[PDB]
Design a protein around this ligand. Structure first.
Ligand code: VS7
Lengths: 300, 237
């Protein structure tokens, strides 16, 4: 179990650590988060009290280094940084634990929610989507746009999600126009899986990462990507049975975890009704369809 | 975007454009089987592809054999239409290719967009006009070539006969659409109007009678009367 020490908390901020969150008051004696589960990626994120505009945050894996949060009064944000002096960090953390200045990552033992939302998410793949090579952790915020969004304006600060476009030459084979547009198995299995992602774990990983960024940061282009990747599977007649079973689980936990009050913006009526009720896989997402209908019958 | 009464003169500018109507691509008669069930028998159809400026009609005849052994024929008809239109463009010299294709039903937008991804500089647009192009099979000579075809075939016509020698494109398009509207609302009366006078003939190389300007005004008025009236007998007014 590892630790993210904060130098201090100079501005009032709501802190999120994965799906948990707590309010820190301006200049309260908060010095970070402890007992963070090793073995998973994590995201620590921030909504200032004064400006609910711009949620931002840091994806990180405690196995990849010792990390702390230091408020930056010039750029006006809580910034994730690395301490390469391992012993100096250990001493800093030991001192703040001895004085009990840290909140404890409050994982319930029955609770596999975070594992279930991050099963295929790995830092190495995050770092490919979010390009800032000098840091082992990855910054994301609400306003970041996606590579595809920039094709429809700063390339350094973008989300390099895989571009999916159902009306594109890559998606449509010459001479199979109708066949490939109404059944996207070619585009899913040959183009995307075999060609781009290599396997379905990489694909699911991007899908989960897109969902989490949409949910935690209200990142619109991440939300588009999540829906696009679901639709590409649901509109393929030919999908490995193990992918369909796993997709049903993935989506089930995403839908379970969504904030009930944010469902109207995070969930796309068209995509979901299509996927659950019209698409080739309309009968293949039993857990997802059951929770959707019981929790958000309104959308459908 | 879409096409309506506000950008109506655009049809007659100097950007090449075609309308594409697919409403006569898949045609069936519906009939009773020996078992008392119902079945459809397909008949020949056509894609109605029209340059509204020149009057040039690329009439792709859709022979019934194209449906043999195929399922979901209404959906395939839309994709067949888009394949034929795509092939048509590819066969034209670049300087003849349309800058826009306007489809008369929104369900052609995705099939055509997909078949034309090769042509990013060709805009595929719907329209809000209720164009009567479906009545094109009420034109005897068009109907005749469709029903006689024994194989796929493309036949070229000028749907305006020689009118562009005497009138503008706008006016000729307005005459065509009034004639087609009339034929669609009441084909018999529309056709009685056009031929009530045995001394007015259809030249072999034309589709419509050889009316003088003054005769065309009478005809156009009569067609308006028909459309007004049938709309009377329809809404009892
Ligand atoms: C002024 C900062 N460099 C203080 C600092 C260095 N390494 C750390 C690790 C954890 C918490 C604070 C620190």
């Amino acid at each position: 179990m590892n630790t993210v020490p904060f130098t201090s908390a100079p501005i009032e901020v709501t802190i999120g650590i994965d799906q948990y969150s707590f309010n820190v008051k301006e200049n309260q004696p908060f010095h970070g988060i402890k007992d963070i589960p090793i073995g998973h990626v994590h995201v620590i994120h921030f909504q200032h009290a004064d400006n609910s505009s711009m949620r931002y945050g840091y994806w990180f894996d405690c196995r990849m280094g010792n990390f702390y949060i230091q408020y930056d009064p010039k750029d006006g944000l809580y910034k994730m940084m690395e301490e390469r002096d391992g012993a100096k960090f250990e001493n800093i953390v030991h001192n703040f634990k001895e004085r009990q200045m840290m909140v404890s990552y409050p994982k319930i033992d029955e609770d596999d929610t975070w594992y279930n939302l991050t099963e295929f998410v790995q830092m190495d793949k995050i770092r490919k989507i979010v390009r800032k090579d000098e840091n082992q952790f990855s910054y994301v915020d609400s306003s970041m746009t996606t590579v595809q969004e920039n094709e429809l304006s700063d390339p350094a600060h973008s989300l390099n999600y895989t571009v999916i476009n159902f009306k594109s030459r890559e998606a449509i084979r010459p001479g199979h126009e109708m066949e490939d547009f109404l059944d996207k198995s070619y585009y899913l299995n040959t183009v995307m899986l075999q060609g781009i992602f290599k396997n379905s774990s990489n694909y699911f990983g991007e899908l989960q990462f897109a969902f989490l960024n949409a949910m935690f940061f209200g990142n619109y282009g991440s939300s588009l990507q999540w829906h696009a990747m679901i639709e590409l599977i649901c509109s393929s007649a030919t999908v490995p049975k193990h992918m369909l079973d796993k997709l049903d689980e993935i989506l089930y936990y995403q839908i379970k975890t969504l904030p009930e009050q944010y469902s109207d913006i995070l969930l796309n009526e068209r995509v979901w009704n299509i996927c659950l009720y019209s698409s080739f896989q309309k009968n293949s997402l039993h857990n997802t369809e059951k929770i959707m209908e019981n929790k958000y019958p309104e959308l459908l | 975007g879409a096409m309506n009464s506000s950008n109506y003169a655009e049809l007659f500018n100097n950007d090449i454009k075609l309308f594409v109507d697919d409403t006569n691509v898949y045609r069936v008669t519906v009939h009773k089987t020996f078992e008392g069930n119902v079945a459809t028998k397909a008949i020949n159809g056509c894609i109605f592809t029209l340059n509204p400026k020149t009057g040039h009609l690329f009439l792709k005849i859709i022979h019934t054999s194209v449906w043999a052994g195929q399922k979901r024929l209404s959906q395939l008809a839309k994709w067949k239409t888009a394949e034929e239109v795509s092939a048509l463009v590819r066969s034209l010299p670049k300087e003849e290719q349309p800058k826009q294709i306007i489809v008369t039903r929104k369900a052609m937008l995705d099939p055509l967009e997909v078949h034309m991804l090769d042509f990013p500089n060709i805009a595929i647009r719907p329209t809000e006009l209720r164009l009567p192009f479906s009545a094109a099979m009420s034109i005897d000579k068009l109907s005749d070539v469709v029903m006689k075809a024994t194989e796929p075939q493309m036949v070229l016509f000028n749907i305006y006969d020689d009118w562009l020698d005497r009138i503008s494109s706008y006016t000729a398009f307005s005459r065509l659409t009034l004639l087609l509207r009339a034929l669609k609302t009441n084909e018999e009366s529309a056709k009685m109007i056009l031929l009530s006078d045995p001394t007015i003939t259809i030249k072999s190389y034309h589709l419509w009678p050889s009316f003088t300007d003054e005769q065309w005004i009478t005809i156009e008025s009569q067609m308006r009367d028909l459309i007004l009236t049938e709309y009377g007998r329809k809404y009892n007014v």
